[PDB]
């Protein structure tokens, strides 16, 4: 399973969708329109 919003994210790959790992604590997975 992937990691959605505010999810801990395990890849910068939009782990879930339309997301991104964000390169700052806490790592999480942040919408593209939100970073």
């Known amino acids: 399973a992937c990691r959605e919003w ?8 939009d782990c879930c969708a339309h997301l991104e790992c ?6 999480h997975c942040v919408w593209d ?3």
């Open 22 to 27: 964000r390169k700052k604590w806490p790592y």
């Open 6 to 13: 505010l999810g801990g994210c395990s890849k910068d790959a």
């Open 33 to 35: 329109w939100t970073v």
